[PDB]
Curated annotation (Swiss-Prot), chains G, H, I:
Gene: APP
Annotated phenotype, changing E11Q: In CAA-APP; Dutch type
Sites annotated Implicated in free radical propagation: G22
Effect seen on changing G22V: Reduced protein oxidation. No hippocampal neuron toxicity
Binding-site residues for Zn(2+) 2, renumbered to this chain: H2, H3
Site (described: Susceptible to oxidation): M24
Region (Interaction with PSEN1): 13-31
Protein name per the record: P3(42)
Length: 34, 34, 34, 34, 34, 34, 31, 31, 31
């Protein structure tokens, strides 16, 4: 038998988040002047 | 037997989030001035 | 036997979220001045 | 002045491609038995 | 002045490609038995 | 002045590619039995 | 030269998505 | 020169997704 | 020169995704 639980993956926030600017989760080339 | 539960993936917020600017989940080239 | 439950995938908000600006789940080229 | 051209996003074989089995672009749940 | 050209994102074989089994681009849960 | 060209992101064989079994680009949970 | 039952199935065959060739001499068969 | 029952299945075959060739001499078989 | 029952299965076969070839002489088999 197996058992897996309570994992997590977070990216820039889990409770409170703001932003003034770029956030790119994945990119191939390009100019993020921001 | 197997069992998997309570996973999670988050991106920029889970409870409260604002934004003034770009948020790109995936991109292939392109100018994000923001 | 198998069992899988209580997964989740959030993107930019789950409970409360505002926005003044772009939000792009996927993109191929293009200029986001934002 | 901006320019963007000749991008691409090829999911699964932008040419002659056989298929005997499941292909899913997004799946929030289920059981895929290929 | 900006330029962006000749990008790419090839998921799984941008040419002749067989397939006998599952292919998933995103999956929040489930059971894939290939 | 900026330039960006001839990028790439090849996930799994940008040419003739067989497949007998699971391929997943992202998976928050589950049981993959290849 | 005596041939009998080159390929043989003795019960149910659930499906088929490919070539089931009893004998080949030449030519292309793209299943 | 006597051939008989080269390939032989005696029970269920769930599914086929490839070549099941009883005899090969020449040519291309792309399953 | 006398061949008989080269390949043999005596129980269920879940699935096939490749070549199950009873004999080879020449040619290409891309399973």
């Amino acid at each position: 038998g197996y058992e897996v639980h309570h994992q997590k993956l977070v990216f820039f926030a889990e409770d409170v988040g703001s932003n003034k600017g770029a956030i790119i989760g994945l990119m191939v080339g390009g100019v993020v002047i921001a």
